[PDB]
Amino acid sequence: TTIIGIIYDNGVMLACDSRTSSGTFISNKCSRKINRINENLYVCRSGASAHSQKIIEIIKHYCVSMKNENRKKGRFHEGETIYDETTYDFLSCALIFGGYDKIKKQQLYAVNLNGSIIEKHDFAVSGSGSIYIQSYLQDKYKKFMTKKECFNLILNCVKYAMHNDNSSGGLIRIVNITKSFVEEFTVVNTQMNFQY
C-alpha cells in the first residue's frame, strides 16, 4: 500500500490507498488503511495488517488513558507518538503519524519498522508504492501550499503510485487536519487515465 503525508501552511493532509493484498490476491478490498485516534490526530498504517492492527488497538487504549489523564480537553500528539516507539522493543510495521497541536501549529512524525521516530517538518511518504513517487514529491513540493494546491498534489501522487504498482488501491481516503478540527475525510474514487 501507499501512504502520503504532506504539510499545509496551517494544517496537514494524509491519504492512502485501499488495497492491502495478501499473496497476489485481493482479500481485503476497499479497507481502511488510515485510522482515527482523536479529534486532532490520525494514524495511517502500512506493512502487514496482522501485527499492525494490534498497535492501533494499543495506541487507542493509551491515548484515551492519556487524554483523560490531563483534563477534559487535554490532548497531545508528540508525546503520544514517542510512546509508539516503546511498543517496538518481534513485529514489523511502519506507521505515519500527524496532527494538530497547541504547543506548535501542526506536526507530523514517521515511525519505521524498527523504532525511529524521525519527524518531518516538510512532508513524508511511506508504504509499498512509496518508492515509485519519491522523486515526484520532492519536485512538486513547495514551501507553503493551500487547501486546494496540496489536495491536487496528493490526488496525483496516490494515483501515480497506484498506476505503476500491483498494490493499487481503489478508492483513496484523503484526510485533512486543521486548527478548527475540520478533519473531513475527502474520499474520492478517481482512476488513472494517461494521455501519452
Partner: protein, 222 residues
C-alpha cells in the same frame, strides 16, 4: 470449505458447504460449518476445524457471560476484539480464517478475521479454499439494499458456484439469516443424486469366524 457471506437491507446472510475433508479423502458428506455465537450474531470459519471449533465455543460462552452481565444484546464489535487479542497470542498455531456478522445497535455488519490477526469490515466476502470461485460470482451480481429473497439465491449461487468449480467443496448448502428478531437455519438446494443409486448388499447371517463370544447381559441402570 467454501464459506461466504453478504449483507442486505436489514440482515446478514451467511452460507457454507457441508463437506470436511482430510485433504485427499472426505470425512463426512454433511458437516454444519455454520456456528451459533448468540441470538444476533453467527460465525463460520475455515482452516483447521480444531482451532475453529474451540474458538467458537470460547466465543459463544464469553459473549454469553458478557451478555448476562449487562442487559443489552451483544454487539458484533465486541467478539471481534476478543478474537484479535486471542489470535495474536497463538499466531503460529491458531490458524482459522473466521467470518462473522449480524445485527446490533448499528447496521448489519459483517467482519472478516484472517488467521494472522487482521480484521476488516466488508459488505460481502468469501472464505476458504473455494473462496475465489465464490467471490467471483459474488462480485458479479452484488447489488445494494437487496431483499432477503434476493440475497437468498445469491448466497446460494455463490456456494453452488464454489461446489462444482472446486474439489474440496461439496455436499449440501446451508444458509442462516441473522435478522433483528431471530435467526434462520435452512438447508436449501439438497442437489438430489439422480444417477445410479447405491445398492447395499446385506451379508448372510452365518459369516465371519468368531473364535469366542463373551456375551454379557448387563441391565443395572435402566
Amino acid at each position: 470449505t467454501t464459506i461466504c457471506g453478504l449483507v442486505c437491507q436489514n440482515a446478514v446472510i451467511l452460507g457454507a458447504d457441508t463437506r470436511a475433508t482430510e485433504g485427499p479423502i472426505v470425512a463426512d458428506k454433511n458437516c454444519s460449518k455454520l456456528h451459533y455465537i448468540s441470538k444476533n450474531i453467527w460465525c463460520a470459519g475455515a482452516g483447521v476445524a480444531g482451532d475453529l471449533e474451540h474458538t467458537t465455543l470460547w466465543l459463544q460462552h464469553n459473549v454469553e457471560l458478557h451478555r448476562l452481565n449487562t442487559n443489552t444484546q451483544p454487539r458484533v464489535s465486541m467478539c471481534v476484539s476478543r478474537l484479535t487479542q486471542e489470535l495474536f497470542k497463538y499466531q503460529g498455531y491458531k490458524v482459522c480464517a473466521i467470518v462473522l456478522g449480524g445485527v446490533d445497535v448499528n447496521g448489519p455488519q459483517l467482519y472478516g478475521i484472517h488467521p494472522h490477526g487482521s480484521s476488516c469490515l466488508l459488505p460481502f466476502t468469501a472464505l476458504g479454499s473455494g473462496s475465489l470461485n465464490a467471490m467471483a460470482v459474488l462480485e458479479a451480481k452484488y447489488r445494494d439494499n437487496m431483499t432477503i429473497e434476493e440475497g437468498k439465491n445469491l448466497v446460494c449461487e455463490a456456494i453452488c458456484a464454489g461446489i462444482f468449480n472446486d474439489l474440496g467443496s461439496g455436499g449440501n448448502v446451508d444458509i442462516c439469516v441473522i435478522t433483528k428478531d431471530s435467526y434462520q437455519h435452512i438447508r436449501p438446494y439438497k442437489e438430489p443424486n439422480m444417477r445410479l443409486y447405491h445398492l447395499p448388499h446385506p451379508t448372510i447371517y452365518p459369516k465371519g469366524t468368531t473364535p469366542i463370544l463373551s456375551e454379557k447381559i448387563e441391565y443395572i441402570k435402566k
